Design a protein around this ligand. Structure first.
Ligand SMILES: CCCCCCCCCCCCCCCCCC(=O)OC[C@H](CO[C@@H]1O[C@H](CO[C@H]2O[C@H](CO)[C@H](O)[C@H](O)[C@H]2O)[C@H](O)[C@H](O)[C@H]1O)OC(=O)CCCCCCCCCCCCCCCCC
Ligand SMILES: CCCCCCCCCCCCCCCCCC(=O)OC[C@H](CO[C@@H]1O[C@H](CO[C@H]2O[C@H](CO)[C@H](O)[C@H](O)[C@H]2O)[C@H](O)[C@H](O)[C@H]1O)OC(=O)CCCCCCCCCCCCCCCCC
Ligand code: CLA
Ligand code: CLA
Ligand code: CLA
Ligand code: CLA
Ligand SMILES: CCCCCCCCCCCCCCCC(=O)OC[C@H](COP(=O)(O)OC[C@@H](O)CO)OC(=O)CCCCCCCCCCCCCCC
Ligand SMILES: CC1=C(/C=C/C(C)=C/C=C/C(C)=C/C=C/C=C(C)/C=C/C=C(C)/C=C/C2=C(C)CCCC2(C)C)C(C)(C)CCC1
Ligand SMILES: CC1=C(/C=C/C(C)=C/C=C/C(C)=C/C=C/C=C(C)/C=C/C=C(C)/C=C/C2=C(C)CCCC2(C)C)C(C)(C)CCC1
Ligand SMILES: CC1=C(/C=C/C(C)=C/C=C/C(C)=C/C=C/C=C(C)/C=C/C=C(C)/C=C/C2=C(C)CCCC2(C)C)C(C)(C)CCC1
Ligand SMILES: CC1=C(/C=C/C(C)=C/C=C/C(C)=C/C=C/C=C(C)/C=C/C=C(C)/C=C/C2=C(C)CCCC2(C)C)C(C)(C)CCC1
Ligand SMILES: CCCCCCCCCCCCO[C@@H]1O[C@H](CO)[C@@H](O[C@H]2O[C@H](CO)[C@@H](O)[C@H](O)[C@H]2O)[C@H](O)[C@H]1O
Ligand SMILES: [Cl-]
Ligand SMILES: [Fe+2]
Lengths: 436, 28, 33, 341, 37, 35, 324, 61, 81, 28
């Protein structure tokens, strides 16, 4: 058919999706079928994880990454992260699988049977990449949808059962957030914080009030920006600053997704609030501090230091992890650091149980899923879910940075007109003066 | 004759099941 | 087109022991350990 | 015309696989080296020479199978099948490590045959034999490491065993016992290999990004004709780019490609020279001035002294199992530990 | 575990997440049918 | 220490603003083929 | 015109001996700062208490090091991942003692090398080139990010970053093998395949082009004088080189397309080094190489050692000596 | 109700297999498109009804 | 080129399939019977999973003499027997 | 065995879609 071979399209089979650049209907079909693939993985992976889930055992000891996501939303869990019913996990998986069937049907229809170009059929859905106003209108629609999604998370946290709060007293519980942080100073002070040790940028969010308030802000900002982009056209500095083509927009999205992937691996490695240690396991700093505290309990029935800023911290190599904050350690932390006599005569059994359990499950493992040090036997099959999520998303974020570089360079070269090579009769360097 | 894509797919599936058999023996 | 070529010899001296060894290794996969 | 001439015409006949006079040496020896390695990694143990399982039959995987070296008590014996050690018995020959010497000797003569094949094909095709010159460096590496190094040492035992994890053991052994990273000949080898990889990447990317537009397609690969006389990429543009980015650039294509020949070949030759030095234990293990300073000053600590401590740990913790013939029994108190330093 | 009434379809679930990967392979199969044109 | 910090902040701000406003100053136009 | 017009025209000028560009107006000060601080620290920095237990490590030449053993010691374990500029320390003595120069050098170097990649793209754009040399450069840059930034982030301290020295690099390698078994990690094996294959294909391509040079000179003259800079005709017979290499292995293992061959030359080591940099990052999040300890057990329950067990013994030997 | 729900779910699996095989085939065959479109509409309605039936029978089983 | 039949024409030939649907299973069966009947252990001297250690000893049977290594291996095999 | 047979059926779903479209000639 049209644009389905090299001679008509100019792209080989290994770049065959590049034949879809100026075919809006088939491109929409590819996108909808791919979205169906994503929802299919979500549903099928949830059902696979549920089919091999022992609800009595912790989730992080069973290699689960999707059931903890639903559990963090306050679905099917009780105090201490205990699983009270597994049925909402099944509901999430089944609804995703069915919706993926619907999306796959639509993708196959628009890719195979539907109109090849959407321009003649509909002025609303027909788009040209050079049409800046239509691009900003579609961007505005998607920004409104994203703001609605953020407000859906807000509505789940405020009206529809709340979220799992690991910082709830007693060992964490599902809690309905009633007073979100609407103050812009806190919300954007998270944005203005340093990304380094002890500060941690937006990864250092440590309460669900800040999370819900930031999501209120993000939803409102996204809806406002969506309306703004529907109502307006790009300004002159914007039109002179960017390349306006499909590959260029793809490259911008690739750079954004690479940055988001790096932020996500840092979130899953460091944050224990939106990634509670009940479901995802302890962080590396969390496990080291738990080891120090449990060995202090053992030796008391010495791990104390002073830190660079003058604060009582655990001693040893875990002096590097003195910025760690966890719900089992915060009751034992005074205003000058760890209160030693408060460790002696105010320890609770749930905190000790958490500390021992997090001792035994440090984020350490091998590729064949052997737990512990790399110099030890294969007696325990454990790799932390935080390690899997962080490693996979660093790999994806780096490759998407590479893809952003590839497509941004190609978009600039194609807009300027030398992406196919140097013109032999108009080689620019030959007209340039010699360097010496 | 047999189409070449049929032969390529059959050889690929056979090599995939021999790799899966070796990995199953590895995990066992 | 001849059959008993040099190419035939090279292909089969690499091919016959390959299948013998693959059957051997599969039978190894079903060892009780 | 004479049996020699008729055989010579048959051997150099155009076919799918070139044979040549060198094929008589190459194809048997290379085939036997490869087949011996596959046979050893599939069936043959290392229980009597190393006390190790090293075959698929024993339960090892692709990373951990090896054709291990003969036992240290064999010395530098050729370990022929008909020799005085095996006395014609194939089973004892396999148990004693005779497959290792089989693979090493047939691989050496196969490498000789492949280089002769390079010479022969360069002669018939009519090109200069620089590919054979470049292949002299892998031959130098193989001869220095698999032949000269064990011959300088006590036996074939300390040569690398033909396997993945066994080669990794060989790397760690050279670190712990020879301090091979501190050797400047190995340093030039590393520079040659990494510079060759850099030259490969940079030259490929430079050619691919200075291509002339010779076709209408967006996939540029079909815009090249093998019989074309013109250059497919702009050397002037590439020279200008690298002159303004890096300060210097190639301006002679022939010098560029000779340099691509020269860098990894020279690196591999330098590393082979260092391996000969290690064959006689003529190692660059230590700097004498830093040894004296560390002896006279307990507070002196550099990364080199820490590396010496790590090497001591490697030696003492790996020697009883890696050298089972010595019967090393190291009690727990003599094993070096960081908590006692 | 899954709800018990679904347990007879437990093996099918065991192969469900691998299905998107096959989709990638299917594309190559399709190209193999058209001669990689 | 504070004078050095302010000096470094000023220098970094100057160079970063040069980068940002330079890439906003019609950068796609500065190519040999089009515009 | 305006002063901003003249400055923009000078910055993006292709007539400069070294191209600056906007990526270069970031790259030049950061790399100059990193270079000056590195030279000064490598010669004259005082010992650094890298482990935060008051046993400092001397890395500079003036304190008893040569070129091989000299290093810029990574910042202190007490610093961790904290940002440590000069003004964050009470004095210059405290900043030097806790390994502040390492942080300054690596942050400036990573910024400058990222802008070096951007500058490569920028000059390719100004010369009408295809833009993907920077993509090839992204592989060593990813490796530098992995060993200087990503591994400290995963392990929780810049004290675990690679030292800026030769023996310090060897120490980093040995401790990394002790803690992560990198040799048994398939991403490092892909990296070794990348660098070994890159050296192989570099030597191969060089020898095949040098082998098929067209006769343009005498025996007394060097053959390099056979090529004129900017000549239009090809300086070597690619058909003869293809015929040689096809007869060396077989006809279908040889590239008849020079563009395909040069793409392969670019792609093999770049992809391999990408995978080894990603391996370093994934072991930074403690996803280690294959263990395979005690993988062979006899009928009676006795462990039969393999080569992997010898590797694990060596790794344990390094591990007990690098701690405390 | 248990065997009824099991039969309905097996029927949903079979019909989903039939649609997965047939719908790209019918979409990429222009010659027989009319009866194919009628069967696709019937199958989509049957699939939606079977999904709803499986859900309510799940609540009953 | 070179006078040999192309690989694609060979592998797509029905005659090639009817020859190679018999010989390849025969070789696979030969290798399976080589391992499963235990002939490989006897041919190559590889110890069985119960034949690494003698019933009384737990010493690894290293060979220690050059010209008595054959007799030493035979002595180890007799002591496990 | 049930997992293997399920893998086999799902794995022949796609290639036989390709086979049906190729034999009953359509726009592949
Ligand atoms: C366009 C872009 C512009 C860029 C230009 C330069 C601007 C700045 C660049 C930033 C670079 C980051 C360096 C340091 C990152 C770091 O220490 O990262 C970690 C931090 C998180 O910080 C940690 O955050 C923690 C927050 O947790 C705290 O709060 C939690 C709440 O649950 C818990 O309670 C926890 O216990 C508690 O400690 C602590 O504060 C830690 O001390 C702190 O180190 O991530 C973060 O800030 C968020 C994510 C950081 C981004 C990742 C960097 C990616 C670089 C590689 C790219 C590849 C290049 C390839 C080229 C080819
Ligand atoms: C020749 C070889 C090369 C051939 C060329 C082709 C290239 C690819 C080859 C891949 C081959 C895969 C082999 C299939 C077997 C397998 O893997 O099988 C293993 C697993 C399934 O096995 C399960 O694996 C589990 C792993 O443990 C996990 O689960 C346990 C309990 O279930 C514990 O909780 C533990 O903590 C947790 O880690 C346990 O062992 C289970 O018992 C077991 O059932 O397959 C899975 O997961 C499947 C993986 C799906 C995608 C995973 C995405 C993650 C990517 C990470 C990127 C970062 C870089 C990493 C470094 C490289
Ligand atoms: C997420 C993956 C993805 C998606 C969505 C697409 C989508 C698309 N590709 Mg594509 N492609 C991909 C990966 C993908 N590709 C990969 C990895 C490669 C490299 C091998 C290619 C190489 C490639 C080339 C070379 C070309 C395309 C083309 C196309 C477009 C037309 C397809 C067509 O006519 O095929 C027709 C094929 C068939 C009719 C065979 C059957 C395919 C069906 C759709 C499979 C459905 C199976 C599924 C289970 C059904 C579920 C339905 C159920 C819900 C009811 C289409 C939009 C073409 C294009 O650009 O058009 C202009 C083109 O020339 N692709
Ligand atoms: C949302 C992300 C996104 C999107 C929409 C695109 C879209 C596109 N890319 Mg692109 N790309 C991306 C991310 C993306 N890219 C990333 C992250 C990278 C860096 C790796 C690249 C690198 C890249 C290059 C180098 C090129 C493109 C090209 C293209 C165009 C044609 C693609 C095609 O037909 O591929 C067909 C698909 C294949 C041939 C399959 C590739 C197989 C992958 C690499 C391996 C998958 C491994 C898997 C994860 C695990 C094993 C699977 C198992 C089955 C074994 C198209 C416009 C081409 C272009 O510029 O055309 C204009 C081109 O040459 N891309
Ligand atoms: C991003 C997704 C997307 C987009 C932009 C389109 C766009 C289009 N489709 Mg299409 N479609 C999609 C997904 C999509 N579709 C899916 C998933 C399916 C499977 C059910 C279909 C099935 C389908 C068919 C069968 C047909 C089209 C047709 C059309 C065209 C005209 C539609 C029209 O006039 O609507 C007017 C507007 C409406 C009818 C209002 C729709 C209101 C929706 C259904 C409510 C959704 C609520 C909420 C946003 C859902 C979120 C889901 C998300 C979370 C996954 C148009 C180009 C027609 C066509 O090509 O004409 C020739 C046509 O015959 N589509
Ligand atoms: C998906 C999200 C998205 C996307 C792609 C766009 C895209 C666009 N917007 Mg936009 N916008 C959005 C969401 C989005 N908007 C939302 C949610 C709002 C409401 C707040 C707005 C409000 C808005 C306004 C008011 C304007 C635009 C404009 C524009 C256009 C110019 C872009 C530009 O040069 O900015 C590039 C970014 C900059 C120049 C900012 C300076 C760069 C700094 C130094 C980067 C610092 C970040 C750094 C990396 C660290 C990150 C952390 C940091 C927060 C501390 C472009 C079409 C302009 C336009 O043309 O209007 C039609 C315009 O005037 N937008
Ligand atoms: C120019 C086309 C290819 C460009 C890209 C090449 C990149 C490199 C990839 C290499 C591997 C894949 C090859 C291409 C593959 C390719 O193009 O596919 C097609 C090609 C076969 O095509 P034909 O049917 O046209 O070839 C048969 C000819 O004889 C023509 O009659 O495949 C092969 O050559 C089979 C390979 C296995 C043959 C095994 C023989 C083993 C015998 C022993 C050999 C010893 C030699 C060494 C001596 C020391
Ligand atoms: C265009 C194109 C393409 C693509 C395609 C796609 C991507 C598609 C998608 C698709 C999809 C995306 C699909 C989906 C489907 C699904 C389904 C069909 C499902 C269903 C479901 C069911 C039936 C359910 C069941 C159940 C339940 C209820 C629960 C329990 C369990 C069980 C499972 C039993 C390719 C690449 C090939 C190439 C060429 C063309
Ligand atoms: C939800 C949440 C939250 C919130 C958040 C927020 C509020 C956010 C926002 C954010 C934002 C608001 C962001 C932004 C970003 C931006 C960016 C990232 C930018 C970029 C830029 C660019 C890319 C540019 C470029 C350029 C240059 C530089 C020059 C010229 C050229 C151009 C234009 C290219 C919190 C944390 C509180 C809590 C938790 C949860
Ligand atoms: C949900 C579920 C389902 C659905 C499913 C689906 C959606 C499926 C799909 C499936 C598919 C969609 C599949 C596909 C497959 C594929 C394959 C199996 C392929 C393979 C391939 C190969 C083997 C290749 C080969 C080759 C070639 C051809 C070329 C190059 C070279 C090589 C050798 C690579 C059902 C309904 C059942 C039921 C209910 C549940
Ligand atoms: C020693 C000896 C000998 C020899 C023998 C021989 C020569 C043998 C051969 C053998 C052979 C000749 C064998 C073969 C084997 C093979 C095998 C066993 C194969 C395997 C394969 C696989 C496993 C595959 C893989 C792959 C690749 C590489 C790529 C893609 C992916 C995969 C993974 C699929 C004689 C008697 C003379 C004398 C005495 C001594
Ligand atoms: C870190 C904070 C950064 C804040 C950045 C946010 C600012 C957003 C709007 C910036 C407006 C800049 O807008 C841009 O400015 C330059 C310099 O004045 C203008 O002027 C430019 O014109 C041409 C355009 O080809 C250039 O060759 C020339 O060098 C320059 O004078 C551009 O025509 C205008 O598009
Ligand atoms: Cl050390
Ligand atoms: Fe070249």
């Amino acid at each position: 058919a049209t644009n389905r071979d090299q001679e008509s399209s100019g792209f080989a089979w290994w770049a065959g999706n590049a034949r879809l650049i100026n075919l809006s209907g088939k491109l929409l079909g590819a996108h909808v079928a791919h979205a169906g693939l994503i929802v299919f993985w979500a549903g099928a992976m949830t059902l696979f994880e549920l089919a091999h889930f022992i609800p009595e055992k912790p989730m992080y000891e069973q290699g689960l990454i999707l059931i903890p996501h639903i559990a963090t939303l306050g679905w099917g869990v009780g105090p201490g992260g205990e699983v009270v019913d597994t049925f909402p996990f099944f509901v999430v998986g089944v609804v995703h699988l069915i919706s993926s069937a619907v999306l796959g049907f639509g993708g196959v229809y628009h890719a195979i049977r539907g109109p090849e170009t959407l321009e003649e059929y509909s002025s609303f859905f027909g788009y040209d990449w050079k049409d800046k106003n239509k691009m900003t209108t579609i961007l505005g629609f998607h920004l409104i949808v994203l703001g609605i999604g953020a407000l859906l998370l807000v509505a789940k946290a405020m009206f529809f059962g709340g979220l799992y709060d690991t910082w709830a007293p007693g060992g964490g519980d599902v809690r309905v957030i009633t007073n979100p942080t609407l103050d812009p100073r806190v919300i954007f002070g998270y944005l203005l914080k340093s990304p380094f040790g002890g500060e941690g940028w937006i990864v250092s969010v440590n309460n669900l009030e800040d999370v819900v308030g930031g999501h209120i802000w993000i939803g409102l900002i996204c809806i406002a920006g969506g309306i703004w982009h529907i109502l307006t056209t790009p300004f002159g500095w914007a039109r002179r600053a960017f390349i306006w083509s499909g590959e260029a927009y793809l490259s911008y999205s690739l750079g954004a997704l690479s940055m988001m992937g790096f932020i996500a691996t840092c979130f899953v490695w460091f944050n224990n609030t939106v990634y509670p240690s009940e479901f995802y396991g302890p962080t590396g700093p969390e496990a080291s501090q738990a080891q120090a505290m449990t060995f202090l309990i053992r030796d008391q029935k010495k791990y104390l230091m002073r830190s660079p800023t003058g604060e009582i911290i655990f001693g040893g190599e875990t002096m590097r992890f003195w910025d760690f904050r966890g719900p089992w350690l915060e009751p034992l932390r005074g205003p000058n650091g760890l209160d030693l006599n408060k460790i002696k005569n105010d320890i609770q059994p749930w905190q000790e149980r958490r500390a021992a359990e997090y001792m035994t499950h440090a984020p350490l493992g091998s590729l064949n899923s052997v737990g512990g040090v790399a110099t030890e036997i294969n007696s325990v099959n454990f790799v932390s879910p935080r390690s899997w999520l962080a490693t996979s998303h660093f790999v994806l974020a780096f490759f998407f940075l590479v893809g952003h570089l590839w497509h941004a360079g190609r978009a600039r070269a194609a807009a300027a007109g030398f992406e196919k090579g140097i013109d032999r009769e108009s080689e620019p360097v030959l007209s340039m003066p010699s360097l010496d | 004759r047999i189409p070449l894509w049929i032969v390529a797919t059959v050889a690929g599936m056979g090599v995939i099941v021999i790799v899966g058999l070796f990995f199953y023996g590895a995990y066992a | 087109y001849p059959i008993f070529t040099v190419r035939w010899v090279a292909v089969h001296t690499l091919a016959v022991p390959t299948i013998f060894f693959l059957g051997a290794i599969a039978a190894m996969q079903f060892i009780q350990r | 015309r004479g049996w020699f001439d008729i055989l010579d015409d048959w051997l150099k006949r155009d076919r799918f696989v070139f044979v040549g006079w060198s094929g008589i040496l190459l194809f048997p020896c290379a085939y036997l080296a490869l087949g011996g390695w596959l046979t050893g990694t599939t069936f043959v143990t290392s229980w009597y020479t190393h006390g190790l399982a090293s075959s698929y039959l024993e339960g090892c995987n692709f990373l951990t199978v090896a054709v291990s070296t003969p036992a240290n008590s064999m010395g530098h014996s050729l370990l022929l099948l008909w020799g005085p050690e095996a006395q014609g018995d194939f089973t004892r020959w396999c148990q004693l490590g005779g497959l290792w010497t089989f693979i090493a000797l047939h691989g050496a003569f196969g490498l000789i045959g492949f280089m002769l094949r390079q010479f022969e094909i360069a002669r018939l095709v009519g090109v200069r034999p620089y590919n054979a010159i470049a292949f002299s460096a892998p031959i130098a590496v193989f001869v220095s490491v698999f032949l000269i190094y064990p011959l300088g040492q006590s036996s074939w035992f300390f040569a690398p065993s033909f396997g993945v994890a066994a080669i990794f053991r060989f790397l760690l052994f050279f670190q712990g016992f020879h301090n091979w990273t501190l050797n400047p000949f190995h340093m030039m080898g590393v520079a040659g290999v990494l510079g060759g990889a850099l030259l490969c990447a940079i030259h490929g990317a430079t050619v691919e990004n200075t291509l002339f537009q010779d076709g209408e397609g967006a996939s540029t690969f079909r815009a090249f004709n093998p019989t074309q006389a013109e250059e497919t990429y702009s050397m002037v543009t590439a020279n200008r780019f690298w002159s303004q980015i890096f300060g210097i650039a190639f301006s002679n294509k022939r010098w560029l490609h000779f340099f691509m020949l020269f860098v990894p070949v020279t690196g591999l030759w330098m590393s082979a020279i260092g391996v000969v030095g290690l064959a006689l234990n003529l190692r660059s293990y230590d700097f004498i001035s830093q040894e004296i300073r560390a002896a006279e000053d307990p507070e002196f600590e550099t990364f080199y002294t820490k590396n010496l401590l790590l090497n001591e740990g490697i030696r003492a913790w790996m020697a009883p199992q890696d050298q089972p013939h010595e019967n090393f029994v190291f009690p727990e108190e003599v094993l070096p530990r960081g908590n006692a330093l | 575990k899954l709800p018990e009434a679904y347990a007879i379809f437990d093996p099918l679930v065991d192969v469900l997440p691998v299905i998107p990967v096959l989709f990638l392979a299917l594309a190559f199969v399709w190209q193999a049918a058209v001669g990689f044109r | 220490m504070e004078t050095l910090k302010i000096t470094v902040y000023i220098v970094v701000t100057f160079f970063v603003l040069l980068f940002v406003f330079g890439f906003l100053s019609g950068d796609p136009a500065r190519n040999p083929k089009r515009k | 015109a305006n002063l901003w017009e003249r400055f923009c025209n000078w910055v993006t000028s292709t007539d400069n001996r070294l191209y600056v560009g906007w990526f270069g107006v970031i790259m030049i000060p950061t790399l100059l700062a990193a270079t000056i601080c590195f030279v000064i620290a490598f010669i004259a920095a005082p010992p650094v208490d890298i482990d935060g237990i008051r046993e400092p490590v001397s890395g500079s030449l003036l304190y008893g090091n040569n070129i091989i053993t000299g290093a810029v010691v990574p910042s202190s374990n007490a610093i961790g991942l904290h940002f440590y500029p000069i003004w964050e320390a009470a004095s210059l003595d405290e900043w030097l003692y806790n390994g502040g120069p390492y942080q300054l050098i690596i942050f400036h170097f990573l910024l400058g090398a990222s802008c070096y990649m951007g500058r490569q793209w920028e000059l390719s754009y100004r010369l009408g080139m295809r833009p993907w040399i920077c993509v090839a450069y992204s592989a060593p840059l990813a490796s530098a990010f992995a060993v200087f930034l990503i591994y400290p982030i995963g392990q929780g301290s810049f004290s675990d970053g690679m030292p800026l020295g030769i023996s310090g690099t060897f120490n980093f390698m040995i401790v990394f093998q002790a803690e992560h078994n990198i040799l048994m990690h398939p991403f490092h094996q892909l990296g070794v395949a990348g660098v070994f294959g890159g050296a192989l294909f570099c030597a191969m391509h060089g020898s095949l082009v040098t082998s098929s040079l067209i006769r343009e000179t005498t025996e007394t003259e060097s053959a390099n004088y056979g090529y004129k800079f900017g000549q239009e005709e090809e300086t070597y017979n690619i058909v003869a080189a293809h015929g040689y290499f096809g007869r060396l292995i077989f006809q279908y293992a040889s590239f008849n397309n020079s563009r395909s061959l040069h793409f392969f030359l670019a792609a093999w080591p770049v992809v391999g080094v990408w995978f080894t940099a990603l391996g370093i990052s994934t072991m930074a999040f403690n996803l280690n190489g294959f263990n395979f300890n005690h993988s062979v057990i006899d009928a009676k329950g006795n462990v039969i050692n393999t080569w992997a067990d010898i590797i694990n013994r060596a790794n344990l030997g390094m591990e007990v000596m690098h701690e405390r | 109700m248990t065997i009824l729900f099991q039969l309905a779910l097996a029927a949903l699996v079979i019909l989903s297999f039939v649609m997965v095989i047939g719908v790209p085939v019918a979409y990429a065959s222009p010659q027989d498109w009319d009866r194919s479109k009628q069967l696709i509409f019937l199958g989509s309605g049957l699939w939606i009804a079977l999904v709803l039936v499986v859900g309510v029978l799940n609540f009953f089983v | 080129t070179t006078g040999e039949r192309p690989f694609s024409d060979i592998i797509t030939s029905v005659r090639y399939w009817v020859i190679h649907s018999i010989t390849i299973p025969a070789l696979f069966i030969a290798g399976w019977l080589f391992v499963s009947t235990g002939l490989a252990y006897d041919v190559f001297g590889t110890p069985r999973p119960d034949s690494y250690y003698a019933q009384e000893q737990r010493s690894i049977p290293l060979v220690t003499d050059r010209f008595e290594a054959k007799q030493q291996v035979e002595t180890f095999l007799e002591q496990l027997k | 065995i049930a997992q293997l047979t399920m893998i086999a059926m799902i794995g022949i779903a796609g290639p036989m879609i390709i086979f049906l479209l190729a034999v009953r000639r359509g726009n592949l």
